[PDB]
Design a protein around this ligand. Structure first.
Ligand SMILES: *[C@@H]1O[C@H](CO)[C@@H](O[C@@H]2O[C@H](CO)[C@@H](O)[C@H](O)[C@H]2NC(C)=O)[C@H](O)[C@H]1NC(C)=O
Ligand SMILES: *[C@@H]1O[C@H](CO)[C@@H](O[C@@H]2O[C@H](CO)[C@@H](O)[C@H](O)[C@H]2NC(C)=O)[C@H](O)[C@H]1NC(C)=O
Ligand SMILES: *[C@@H]1O[C@H](CO)[C@@H](O[C@@H]2O[C@H](CO)[C@@H](O)[C@H](O)[C@H]2NC(C)=O)[C@H](O)[C@H]1NC(C)=O
Ligand SMILES: *[C@@H]1O[C@H](CO)[C@@H](O[C@@H]2O[C@H](CO)[C@@H](O)[C@H](O)[C@H]2NC(C)=O)[C@H](O)[C@H]1NC(C)=O
Ligand SMILES: *[C@@H]1O[C@H](CO)[C@@H](O[C@@H]2O[C@H](CO)[C@@H](O)[C@H](O)[C@H]2NC(C)=O)[C@H](O)[C@H]1NC(C)=O
Ligand SMILES: *[C@@H]1O[C@H](CO)[C@@H](O[C@@H]2O[C@H](CO)[C@@H](O)[C@H](O)[C@H]2NC(C)=O)[C@H](O)[C@H]1NC(C)=O
Lengths: 268, 109, 50, 49
């Protein structure tokens, strides 16, 4: 309507219509919050790494959170964050702010470094890192002798690999294609919806006030009705597109949660 | 065996139950408790040779050394039957001194 | 009362390069999971409704 | 003892029932016409209008 009493009175005769749209959108928002909370919140406590770090030669400085920075994020997290860039539409903030998500990730990582996979089932149990790596080689079918005899070489390879991945992520662009794609899709959908507000739909004008103060009521009402039906159709289309995209995102989030529960809290 | 798929912990088995428009699973899982601190060591040097555990881990209660399974404290005396040998105690980082008892020599008397 | 959500408890597991922790007892826990599989079958006729 | 442990199934049933309720309630809208009852329109006016 855009603040027009006549439009509201005309619209009253279409029955309960936008209650459906509001219910659908509220369902979508609740689903988003549930998705995030399900993926990340999977530990009962918040662990912390010891101040002194001697993990048999391995080096996790690139990944562990940095207390110096205000956000308590890490190097790779900062790289990822930096690389990627009205008429009743409203955007609601997510329930979880980024600091709490970073805190979950830090707790998970500290737990998996210090306890192995034991903290996934019960209470976390300490274990020296080299022995954990020996367990993990023994898992895949190689005797634990190999790691104890080539610890130095293995640590060097791991450090070189982590440095290489940091450099490749820092330099090469167009690596985070999917997230940027999602953002672009949402922004474009909103943009076209707001753009749609400037079409005649077979009426004499695209602005309501002019139509009001040009004709008598019995003739203006037809144009009003045409505007009403056109805008309602556009709104329905937008809602349906949002529903489809939300379903796809939910499937992706479920897959991510399964991957994180199976390949982080235990060997696969 | 896929962790946290059905249950929360180590899976043992499950039971199905009907429900008006769906199903209800009862998962039975195993959860450990009542921990205890111990001192460890990756391998044992003895007679200039390194010994590793076939299946288990070395622990010490303060004075003696034992091998246990990784999920339940149950110490046993280190013997040439539950350990294997490879190399010499010169390239492992953390090896400690001890003696490995074997049955055949005392049996022979 | 309105407050700031608390993520959880706090602890710092004692890590050292020659110390482990081994369980000495166990427990058996039974949990439940619920899943929908179906919904009611309905049917609508045009010419009667419209 | 404790209730509200079967939220998912109840949610499904509620959603279906509410969709049917709004669908059947939609049958009482003039939609810009002069009445919401077809038989009244047939009884009052003539086909050409
Ligand atoms: C882990 O690797 C990092 C590499 O980022 C090491 O940090 C570098 O250390 C050298 C030596 O002092 C410095 O010249 C670099 O400027 C450091 N880089 C950064 C980004 O700070 C770190 O020293 C390694 N860990 C240990 C224990 O040595
Ligand atoms: C570590 O375990 C050993 C093996 O049981 C303990 O040695 C025994 O201690 C008991 C205590 O009365 C004696 O009766 C046994 O004769 C000891 N064994 C031998 C072979 O002499 C040892 O005391 C334990 N240490 C600690 C700190 O618990
Ligand atoms: C485990 O950590 C300890 C301390 O963090 C290390 O102990 C040092 O070992 C060297 C080598 O013998 C000594 O020169 C130092 O004096 C020790 N530190 C102290 C404070 O006494 C130990 O090397 C590490 N690795 C193990 C035990 O395998
Ligand atoms: C384990 O025992 C061996 C021999 O019983 C020790 O090896 C001796 O170490 C000292 C100190 O470095 C040397 O002076 C001797 O020449 C070594 N003897 C032999 C035969 O190699 C070894 O040090 C002991 N382990 C520990 C951790 O002390
Ligand atoms: C195992 O040894 C540690 C250190 O000797 C015991 O002390 C705990 O140390 C951690 C980290 O330093 C603290 O968070 C705990 O509060 C300490 N315990 C107490 C009672 O204060 C520890 O208690 C021992 N036992 C276990 C099961 O870890
Ligand atoms: C493992 O834990 C169980 C209970 O969690 C212990 O069983 C209890 O033992 C005490 C003392 O013997 C009894 O008073 C209780 O009645 C027992 N509970 C039950 C349910 O039977 C068990 O003793 C623990 N394991 C060990 C080796 O002590």
């Amino acid at each position: 309507c855009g603040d027009s009493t006549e439009c509201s009175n005309l619209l009253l005769q279409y029955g309960s219509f936008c209650t459906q749209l509001n219910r659908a959108l509220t369902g979508i928002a609740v689903e988003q919050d549930k998705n995030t909370q399900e993926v990340f919140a999977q530990v009962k406590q918040i662990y912390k790494t010891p101040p002194i770090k001697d993990f048999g030669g391995f080096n996790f400085s690139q990944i562990l959170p940095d207390p110096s920075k205000p956000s308590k994020r890490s190097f790779i997290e900062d790289l990822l964050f930096n690389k990627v860039t009205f008429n009743g539409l409203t955007v609601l903030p997510p329930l979880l702010t980024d600091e709490m998500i970073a805190q979950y990730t830090s707790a998970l990582l500290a737990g998996t470094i210090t306890s192995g996979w034991t903290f996934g089932a019960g209470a976390a149990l300490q274990i020296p890192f080299a022995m954990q790596m020996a367990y993990r080689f023994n898992g895949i079918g190689v005797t634990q002798n190999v790691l104890y005899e080539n610890q130095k070489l293995i640590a060097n390879q791991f450090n070189s690999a982590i440095g290489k991945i940091q450099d490749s992520l820092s330099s090469t662009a167009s690596a985070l294609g999917k997230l940027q794609n999602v953002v672009n899709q949402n922004a474009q959908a909103l943009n076209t919806l707001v753009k749609q507000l400037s079409s005649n739909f077979g009426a004499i004008s695209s602005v309501l006030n002019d139509i009001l103060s040009r004709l008598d009521p019995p003739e203006a009402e037809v144009q009003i009705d045409r505007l009403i039906t056109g805008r309602l159709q556009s709104l329905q289309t937008y809602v349906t597109q949002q529903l489809i995209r939300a379903a796809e995102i939910r499937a992706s989030a479920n897959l991510a949660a399964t991957k994180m529960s199976e390949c982080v809290l235990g060997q696969s | 065996k896929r962790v946290d798929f059905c249950g929360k912990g180590y899976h043992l088995m499950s039971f199905p139950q009907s429900a008006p428009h769906g199903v209800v699973f009862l998962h039975v899982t195993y959860v450990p408790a009542q921990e205890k601190n111990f001192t460890t060591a990756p391998a044992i040097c003895h007679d200039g040779k390194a010994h590793f555990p076939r299946e288990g881990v070395f622990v010490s209660n303060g004075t003696h050394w034992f091998v246990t399974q990784r999920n339940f404290y149950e110490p046993q005396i280190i013997t040439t039957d539950n350990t294997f040998v490879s190399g010499n105690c010169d390239v492992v980082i953390g090896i400690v001194n001890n003696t490995v008892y074997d049955p055949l020599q005392p049996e022979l008397d | 009362i309105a407050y700031t959500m608390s993520l959880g408890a706090e602890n710092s597991v004692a890590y050292s390069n020659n110390s482990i922790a081994i369980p000495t007892n166990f427990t058996i826990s039974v949990t439940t999971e619920i899943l929908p599989v179906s919904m009611t079958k309905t049917s609508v006729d045009c010419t009667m409704y419209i």
